[PDB]
Design a protein around this ligand. Structure first.
Ligand SMILES: [Ca+2]
Ligand SMILES: [Ca+2]
Lengths: 143, 62
């Protein structure tokens, strides 16, 4: 809404290598590989399709602005993250074991590093049964 | 359901953690010798996009 635009335009221009005002899967993949990532074409297409509002397969600056302005901590995201934790809370007591949490975080999905999970758990505030109250996580990430 | 749930938690946490400039989440970019400001910016964009993808995939499975 102010000088944020110049920042977002700088950010946009990092991805749009050929300068045509449009970001393709190929260009997104170029930036990610330069960070040492190895995304598949399926992952590149999902990322574009989430931002690409007119369905032409590429990202223009207004679509980029829309995604950079999207709310990440609103009530809808809060409830979705809470239901994601609830998948691992079979009994529905509001608690996950620290051991189950570390295994899920390190071995499934994106696979966080041990140091990353260490940082998660340190902020978790475990109880005296090795259980994590994940509602605290949800609130902590959406505050 | 389970992979989609794990990935939403992990991408959400990676977005949150990238707000703290000294988080251990920054040490994973081992291809880069020195993390510069413009790297931090592009990484934040990518992470925001990965979170939105994970949110959509979980909404489908939930
Ligand atoms: Ca382009
Ligand atoms: Ca488009």
């Amino acid at each position: 809404t102010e000088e944020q635009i110049a920042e977002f335009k700088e950010a946009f221009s990092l991805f749009d290598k050929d300068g045509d005002g449009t970001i393709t899967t190929k260009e997104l993949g170029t930036v990610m590989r330069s960070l040492g990532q190895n995304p598949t074409e399926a992952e590149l297409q999902d990322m574009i399709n989430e931002v690409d509002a007119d369905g032409n397969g590429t990202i223009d600056f207004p679509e980029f602005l829309t995604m950079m302005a999207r709310k990440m901590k609103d009530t809808d995201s809060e409830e979705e993250i809470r239901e994601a934790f609830r998948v691992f809370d079979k009994d529905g007591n509001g608690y996950i074991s620290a051991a189950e949490l570390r295994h899920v975080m390190t071995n499934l999905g994106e696979k966080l590093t041990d140091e990353e999970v260490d940082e998660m758990i340190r902020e978790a505030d475990i109880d005296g049964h090795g259980q994590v109250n994940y509602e605290e996580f949800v609130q902590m990430m959406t505050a | 359901q389970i992979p989609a749930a794990a990935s939403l938690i992990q991408t959400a946490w990676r977005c949150y953690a990238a707000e703290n400039p000294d988080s251990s989440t920054w040490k994973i970019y081992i291809r880069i010798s020195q993390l510069r400001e413009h790297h931090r910016a592009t990484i934040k964009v990518i992470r925001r996009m990965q979170y939105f993808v994970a949110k959509k995939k979980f909404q489908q499975a939930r």
